[PDB]
Symmetry: none
Subunit: 204 residues, 2 copies
């Protein structure tokens, strides 16, 4: 009996698998071509440079190919394991280097709660359900984007939307929905900005 | 109106030659019963050389009770005169000693009903009350004191409420625009990040 799938026939390509490096802080995509590999489930696992799982968004293109996207928020080595029908595809695991860009040290951060400016200050205590607005001025930071990653008490890593105003500035809006310890990590071009990470405890 | 300052005697906890604990209000007694009739004056200079308020109670019996708050550690110089003449052993040089561990105090700021964590400034709004709660639960022996330096140069001793659970509340509203310096000490020493510099704006 011939197997229903053949992972050895899956082909991968695209910017997100460039072994010569990708720029940190920018979302990136790659393509998986399973048209010759029969019928199976495509799975993609990503381990970030700190050893934590990272979300891999898989889009079914309808024709036997798939587009996978992820956000290398931090610089360093990303390990991407790709399997089809439970079997690893050729060249997996991929080892992708996210390279730093710009100068995160030149970013300026100001925090506001309820319209009260706090400067580059947050916590240690925050209130559950109270929105925090964090503005990052990256006018002098050069090439790169601001990313915000929140480590939640339950252990998840949330990629928080960063509004790019194109002023060279960025706005971050976050509200802690549950009690416990959060780590609010703000990076530019893959590296911490001054005062990041912010460790906070949500209460009340 | 004859007086003799050389017959005035001064003693008490506030003049203890072995030292006093910083951050606690203290009192001393001036006995002028043998010194005739004259005006008593008490001038206190703190370790930074600033005048410190001296509350004088005339006891109506030839004696007076004087009280002051040594908010910071160091030498306090207390000059006492009767009828304009310095009394024996004046000026008194009293050492206020630190107590507890001010570095273990934790700050919580509240403005307009919002808890702002340990984040005071850089700006405050004129006429808007700020509540600064100092958690001294892990700081041991001592009290929280606070002095505010205003734009015009005045030095205001702000009354600090002791909640008797280890925490203290400071209430302050900036009435005028400009730069304020908020000094917060525990047991005579600056808590972390004190003094706090803030700018009052419209």
């Amino acid at each position: 009996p011939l197997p229903a799938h053949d992972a050895s026939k899956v082909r991968a390509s695209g910017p997100g698998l460039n072994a010569s490096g990708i720029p940190a802080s920018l979302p990136v995509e790659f393509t998986i071509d399973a048209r010759d590999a029969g019928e199976g489930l495509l799975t993609v696992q990503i381990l970030d440079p700190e050893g934590k799982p990272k979300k891999a968004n898989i889009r079914d293109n309808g024709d036997g190919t798939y587009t996978v996207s992820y956000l290398p928020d931090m610089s360093g080595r990303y390990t991407i394991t790709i399997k089809y029908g439970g079997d690893e595809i050729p060249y997996s695991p991929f080892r992708i280097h996210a390279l730093p860009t710009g100068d995160a040290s030149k970013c300026l951060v100001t925090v506001s709660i309820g319209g009260h400016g706090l400067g580059a200050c947050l916590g240690p205590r925050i209130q559950i359900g109270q929105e925090t607005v964090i503005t990052v001025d990256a006018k002098a930071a050069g090439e790169g984007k601001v990313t915000c990653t929140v480590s939640t008490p339950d252990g998840a890593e949330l990629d928080v939307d960063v509004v790019e105003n194109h002023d060279g500035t960025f706005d971050i809006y976050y509200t802690a929905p549950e009690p416990g310890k959060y780590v609010i990590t703000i990076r530019f071009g893959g590296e911490h900005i001054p005062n990041s990470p912010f460790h906070v405890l949500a209460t009340e």
